Curated annotation (Swiss-Prot), chain A:
This is DNA-directed RNA polymerases I, II, and III subunit RPABC1. PANTHER family: DNA-DIRECTED RNA POLYMERASES I, II, AND III SUBUNIT RPABC1. One of its GO terms (molecular function) is DNA-directed RNA polymerase activity. Pfam families: RNA_pol_Rpb5_C, RNA_pol_Rpb5_N. SUPFAM superfamilies: Eukaryotic RPB5 N-terminal domain, RPB5-like RNA polymerase subunit. It comes from Homo sapiens. Component of the RNA polymerase I (Pol I), RNA polymerase II (Pol II) and RNA polymerase III (Pol III) complexes consisting of at least 13, 12 and 17 subunits, respectively. Pol I complex consists of a ten-subunit catalytic core composed of POLR1A/RPA1, POLR1B/RPA2, POLR1C/RPAC1, POLR1D/RPAC2, POLR1H/RPA12, POLR2E/RPABC1, POLR2F/RPABC2, POLR2H/RPABC3, POLR2K/RPABC4 and POLR2L/RPABC5; a mobile stalk subunit POLR1F/RPA43 protruding from the core and additional subunits homologous to general transcription factors POLR1E/RPA49 and POLR1G/RPA34. (Microbial infection) Interacts with HBV protein X. Disulfide bonds: none annotated. There is a cross-link at K80 (Glycyl lysine isopeptide (Lys-Gly) (interchain with G-Cter in SUMO2)).
Swiss-Prot record, chain B:
The keyword Acetylation applies. The chain holds residues 49 to 127 of 127 of the full protein. One of its GO terms (biological process) is tRNA transcription by RNA polymerase III. Keywords: Acetylation, DNA-directed RNA polymerase, Nucleus, Phosphoprotein, Transcription. This is DNA-directed RNA polymerases I, II, and III subunit RPABC2. Component of the RNA polymerase I (Pol I), RNA polymerase II (Pol II) and RNA polymerase III (Pol III) complexes consisting of at least 13, 12 and 17 subunits, respectively. Pol I complex consists of a ten-subunit catalytic core composed of POLR1A/RPA1, POLR1B/RPA2, POLR1C/RPAC1, POLR1D/RPAC2, POLR1H/RPA12, POLR2E/RPABC1, POLR2F/RPABC2, POLR2H/RPABC3, POLR2K/RPABC4 and POLR2L/RPABC5; a mobile stalk subunit POLR1F/RPA43 protruding from the core and additional subunits homologous to general transcription factors POLR1E/RPA49 and POLR1G/RPA34. DNA-dependent RNA polymerase catalyzes the transcription of DNA into RNA using the four ribonucleoside triphosphates as substrates. Common component of RNA polymerases I, II, and III which synthesize ribosomal RNA precursors, mRNA precursors and many functional non-coding RNAs, and small RNAs, such as 5S rRNA and tRNAs, respectively. Pol II is the central component of the basal RNA polymerase II transcription machinery. Pols are composed of mobile elements that move relative to each other. It is found in: Nucleus; Nucleus, Nucleolus. It comes from the Eukaryota. The keyword Acetylation applies. One of its GO terms (cellular component) is nucleoplasm. Its main location: nucleus. Belongs to the archaeal Rpo6/eukaryotic RPB6 RNA polymerase subunit family.
Curated annotation (Swiss-Prot), chain C:
The clamps form the DNA-binding cleft. Zn(2+) 2 binds at C5, C8. It comes from Homo sapiens (Human). This is DNA-directed RNA polymerase I subunit RPA1. Residues 11-98 are annotated as: Clamp. Belongs to the RNA polymerase beta' chain family. Catalytic core component of RNA polymerase I (Pol I), a DNA-dependent RNA polymerase which synthesizes ribosomal RNA precursors using the four ribonucleoside triphosphates as substrates. Transcribes 47S pre-rRNAs from multicopy rRNA gene clusters, giving rise to 5.8S, 18S and 28S ribosomal RNAs. Pol I-mediated transcription cycle proceeds through transcription initiation, transcription elongation and transcription termination stages.
């Protein structure tokens, strides 16, 4: 309806804005601190009437190293998403030479379309999120520590300080919720600052497998 | 290369240094210190550890297989 | 004897299962724990392209990548005894037999 779907769209917009900033994309402070009244000012209210369409909420953030790698965040219209929609999304990405997107479904995808999103090349990195798991940012929880993806120069000096192989380092799954939040490829090492109680902060490292 | 481990002798190292050196003095190895009437090789090995007169090298193996060599003369012994 | 034909004496698996698990085990001999998903990603797009022939053992992308990984990682045979390599090898063998 109204006044509940606007709240859900406001929260899952704010959460993907926080997600895109944490991955390192250009997001302003006003776009992070967007209140619900400012959301009803920018986009419409009454989504059942369709003043905010989920087509209208598709954002395009760009990365801070260079503006060549920018990322879509699609909010698809249909509740159950098949391959017919993601082919259209990949045809939109191939025009503007976009190499990465993020589909926020409201019920889950079909497993055929799941294997399709995996089955795209390094030319198209497509990710998927349920709407329900974007109602709160999980990285703001008190138990979730801070995760920092490491450059390949920091992984080299890591494995050189301890004289260590990547087979020996601890693991984090690639379907882990915080690895899916930060959008981490397999093979990358994630620096983790634990809010320890015996020490103040504790640096551990996990590899994405 | 530069030796990047602890300058102190750990408690597990002085046990095995005193064990190896007391086993040497259990054979007729020459005693570097003055025997003040001791008949126990552990007490003689403790006097040799205190006087910094043990020549054995501790080879501290790192878990990749690498090592680094320390004499007991260049480790800091405590009580 | 259960999961094989007794006339032609072949395994009645799909052939992609056999070639994928062969290449994954060849990679896990040299401890390259990274490539067991990379081989799966190669085979899924190769089967999205076209079905495979059984008479050719190589799939032109799996044996090539597997040869690159094994030739790249030569001193990784004595580093294949960690928990992650042993867990992944155990999981692949057990998932095949189940
Ligand atoms: Zn047969």
């Amino acid at each position: 309806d109204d006044e509940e779907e606007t709240y859900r769209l406001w929260k899952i917009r704010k959460t993907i804005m926080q997600l895109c900033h944490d991955r390192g994309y250009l997001v302003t402070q006003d776009e992070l601190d967007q209140t619900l009244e400012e959301f009803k000012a920018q986009f419409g209210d009454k989504p059942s009437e369709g003043r905010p369409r989920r087509t209208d909420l598709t954002v395009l953030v760009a990365h801070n190293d260079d503006p060549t790698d920018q990322m879509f965040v699609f909010f698809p219209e249909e509740p159950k998403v098949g391959i017919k929609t993601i082919k259209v999304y990949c045809q939109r990405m191939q025009e503007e030479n976009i190499t990465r997107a993020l589909i926020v479904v409201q019920q889950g995808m079909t497993p055929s379309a799941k294997q399709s999103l995996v089955d795209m090349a390094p030319k198209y990195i497509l990710e998927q999120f349920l709407q329900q798991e974007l109602l709160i940012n999980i990285t703001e929880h008190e138990l979730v520590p801070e995760h920092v993806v490491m450059t390949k120069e920091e992984v080299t000096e890591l494995l050189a300080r301890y004289k260590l192989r990547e087979n020996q380092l601890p693991r984090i799954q690639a379907g882990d919720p915080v690895a899916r939040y930060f959008g981490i490829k397999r093979g990358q090492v994630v620096k983790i600052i634990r809010p320890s109680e015996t020490a103040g902060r504790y640096i551990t490292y996990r590899l994405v497998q | 290369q530069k030796r990047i481990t602890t300058p102190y002798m750990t408690k597990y190292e002085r046990a095995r240094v005193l064990g190896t050196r007391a086993l040497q003095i259990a054979m007729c190895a020459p005693v570097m210190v003055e025997l003040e009437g001791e008949t126990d090789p552990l007490l003689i090995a403790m006097k040799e550890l205190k006087a910094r007169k043990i020549p054995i090298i501790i080879r501290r193996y790192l878990p990749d297989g690498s090592y680094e060599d320390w004499g007991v003369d260049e480790l800091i012994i405590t009580d | 004897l259960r999961g094989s034909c007794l006339n032609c004496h072949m395994l009645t698996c799909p052939r992609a299962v056999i070639h994928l698990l062969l290449c994954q085990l060849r990679v896990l001999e040299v401890g390259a724990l990274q490539a067991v998903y990379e081989l799966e990603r190669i085979l899924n797009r190769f089967l999205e392209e076209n079905p495979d022939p059984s008479a050719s053992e190589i799939r032109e992308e799996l044996e090539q990548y597997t040869t690159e990984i094994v030739q790249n990682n030569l001193l990784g045979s004595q580093g294949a005894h960690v928990k992650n390599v042993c867990e992944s090898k155990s999981k692949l063998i057990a998932l095949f037999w189940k």
